[PDB]
Amino acid sequence: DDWEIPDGQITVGQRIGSGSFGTVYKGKWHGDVAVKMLNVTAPTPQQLQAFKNEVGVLRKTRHVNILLFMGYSTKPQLAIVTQWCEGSSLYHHLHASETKFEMKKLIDIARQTARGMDYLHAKSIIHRDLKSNNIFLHEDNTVKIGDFGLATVKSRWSGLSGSILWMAPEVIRMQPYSFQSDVYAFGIVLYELMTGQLPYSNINNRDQIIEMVGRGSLSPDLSKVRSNCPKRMKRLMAECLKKKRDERPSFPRILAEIEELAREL
Amino acid sequence: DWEIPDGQITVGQRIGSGSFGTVYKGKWHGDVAVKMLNVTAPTPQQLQAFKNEVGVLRKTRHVNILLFMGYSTKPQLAIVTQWCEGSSLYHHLHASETKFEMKKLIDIARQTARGMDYLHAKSIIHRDLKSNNIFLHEDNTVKIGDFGLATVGSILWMAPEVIRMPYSFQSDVYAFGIVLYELMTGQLPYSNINNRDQIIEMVGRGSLSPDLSKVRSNCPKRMKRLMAECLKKKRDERPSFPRILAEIEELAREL
Numbered sequence: 001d002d003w004e005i006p007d008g009q010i011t012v013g014q015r016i017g018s019g020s021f022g023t024v025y026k027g028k029w030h031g032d033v034a035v036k037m038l039n040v041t042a043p044t045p046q047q048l049q050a051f052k053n054e055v056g057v058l059r060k061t062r063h064v065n066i067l068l069f070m071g072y073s074t075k076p077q078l079a080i081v082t083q084w085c086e087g088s089s090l091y092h093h094l095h096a097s098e099t100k101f102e103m104k105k106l107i108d109i110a111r112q113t114a115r116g117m118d119y120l121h122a123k124s125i126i127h128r129d130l131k132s133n134n135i136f137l138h139e140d141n142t143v144k145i146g147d148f149g150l151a152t153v154k155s156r157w158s159g160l161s162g163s164i165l166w167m168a169p170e171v172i173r174m175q176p177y178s179f180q181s182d183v184y185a186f187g188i189v190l191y192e193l194m195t196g197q198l199p200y201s202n203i204n205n206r207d208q209i210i211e212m213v214g215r216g217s218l219s220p221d222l223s224k225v226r227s228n229c230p231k232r233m234k235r236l237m238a239e240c241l242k243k244k245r246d247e248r249p250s251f252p253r254i255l256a257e258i259e260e261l262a263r264e265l
Numbered sequence: 266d267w268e269i270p271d272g273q274i275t276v277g278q279r280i281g282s283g284s285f286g287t288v289y290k291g292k293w294h295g296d297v298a299v300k301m302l303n304v305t306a307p308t309p310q311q312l313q314a315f316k317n318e319v320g321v322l323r324k325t326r327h328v329n330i331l332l333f334m335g336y337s338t339k340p341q342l343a344i345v346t347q348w349c350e351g352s353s354l355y356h357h358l359h360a361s362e363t364k365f366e367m368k369k370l371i372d373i374a375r376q377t378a379r380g381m382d383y384l385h386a387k388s389i390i391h392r393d394l395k396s397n398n399i400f401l402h403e404d405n406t407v408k409i410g411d412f413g414l415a416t417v418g419s420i421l422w423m424a425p426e427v428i429r430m431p432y433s434f435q436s437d438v439y440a441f442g443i444v445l446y447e448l449m450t451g452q453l454p455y456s457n458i459n460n461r462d463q464i465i466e467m468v469g470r471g472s473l474s475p476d477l478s479k480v481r482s483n484c485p486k487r488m489k490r491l492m493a494e495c496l497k498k499k500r501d502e503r504p505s506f507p508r509i510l511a512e513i514e515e516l517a518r519e520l
């Protein structure tokens with residue numbers, strides 16, 4: 001129950017990515033690990049509470065498709081240790097490296113993602129930021145879901161531009177995060193896999209997306225799916241992207257639908 | 266708080282049975298491996314052995330240890346872990362005649378050293394480290410666990426003090442040396458000993474030791490040295506897993 005890692009055991013190695021609130025390094029601790037530490041030693045209360053929360057939901061997860069939480073360190077800096085994964089994100093595969101997956105591989109990635117998301121909702125955990133950049137393809141094969149954003153955490157008076165494409169219309173309106181908003185973002189991930197594209201490719205700017213999607217005048221073009229896309233996947237995709245929250249399926253039914261389709265090959 | 270309520274796990278195909286428990290393939294947010302007691306009314310030894318098993322598994326979070334996922338208390342005492350595809354290192358090395366590259370053999374030893382170095386840091390003695398409990402998940406990554414089912418077969422990895430009858434971190438290191446022997450020679454130790462009663466007796470008296478010369482010709486010189494150190498007859502002459510892992514990781518980066 002004590003996943004604290006004493007000072008001096010982790011060798012902080014090469015630096016791999018940083019933003020505001022923390023920097024992530026590759027590390028050595030009984031093998032290869034990924035370490036995320038706060039840049040400072042005197043953390044603000046909001047920074048400290050985000051540390052408690054992140055650990056609090058990570059120590060609640062034990063699943064092959066969730067990034068393996070391994071421990072935390074509080075001295076000299078607040079740090080979080082996870083397993084090290086080789087490869088790149090689904091987003092990098094689909095939209096940067098032009099990686100061509102066979103349809104059998106695309107459905108399998110969707111199935112593993114559905115397993116991890118079905119697990120998170122069973123543990124009463126809303127992901128809040130499910131996008132193809134936070135679906136890691138461990139060794140280009142197994143899915144590891146996490147929150148790889150080094151995003152700036154809320155202050156005492158804050159009330160995204162790389163997550164607008166996966167935001168449900170009610171999240172955009174902000175009048176918000178639920179199991180159904182996670183389901184919507186999953187449908188956009190389904191869209192990426194089945195179409196090979198990001199939604200709203202014919203929309204020049206992001207401000208038009210925010211207002212138009214939030215007002216119901218914009219929806220992803222479902223007609224862009226590849227021809228070898230399974231017919232029952234086109235429907236489940238549209239079911240996840242329904243405008244109203246209480247009409248999109250829950251992940252149990254989502255996973256079962258996809259597990260069936262996989263057995264049909 | 267890892268309890269899984271009754272009725273959520275779908276028990277599928279049976280994978281193996283013993284005198285007291287059986288393990289099945291299952292469906293619970295994906296594929297899971299479930300091991301259950303055959304009976305419903307468990308004895309104090311069964312209830313407490315169940316607690317101990319869960320108690321040492323819920324302290325493990327490492328890529329090279331079998332991922333503990335949960336347990337259930339109704340109607341049967343069950344323990345749920347991830348499902349791994351493939352077969353054990355023992356099956357690869359001695360039944361399927363799988364030819365691993367020398368680079369891949371050093372990799373398997375390195376991952377195994379990572380899993381054992383992690384277990385010892387958590388103050389956990391394995392007591393049964395053998396090539397049959399080293400699962401090669403998807404023919405690549407190592408998963409160390411206890412895949413043995415008791416039926417009312419681990420002599421080759423027993424230190425002379427364990428055979429004498431005992432278990433410590435150092436005896437776990439010895440079994441690692443025998444696992445190292447398997448990888449570097451492709452054979453089990455004492456291939457030329459007809460019966461096991463002779464192995465138990467001669468190894469316990471120090472008159473029998475693994476033939477280290479049967480190592481493959483391309484075995485790294487420093488792997489020979491580290492193998493013989495892990496198999497040292499005196500307990501306090503065997504290295505600890507921190508120094509073992511560091512040696513293998515250097516060797517692997519040296520290629």
Ligand SMILES: Cc1ccc(NC(=O)c2ccnc(C(F)(F)F)c2)cc1-c1cc(OCCO)nc(N2CCOCC2)c1
Pocket residue numbers: 016017024034035036054057058061066067080081082083084085086120125126127145146147148149150
């Ligand atoms: C280090 C770290 C600690 C905690 C967390 N926190 C979560 O994952 C999280 C937060 C909230 N909720 C959830 C939920 F899943 F439970 F919802 C999960 C992430 C990292 C981390 C960051 C990052 O940034 C670099 C991106 O390349 N790269 C990586 N690696 C790069 C590739 O090889 C290895 C992994 C690891």
Ligand SMILES: Cc1ccc(NC(=O)c2ccnc(C(F)(F)F)c2)cc1-c1cc(OCCO)nc(N2CCOCC2)c1
Pocket residue numbers: 280281288298299300318321322325330331344345346347348349350384389391409410411412413414
């Ligand atoms: C089901 C189960 C529950 C608990 C446990 N508990 C430990 O492993 C354990 C306990 C204490 N300490 C450690 C340490 F490693 F951390 F020390 C590990 C094991 C199983 C289990 C049994 C087994 O029987 C083998 C059938 O061939 N096959 C598998 N599957 C083989 C095929 O694919 C997936 C895995 C899983």
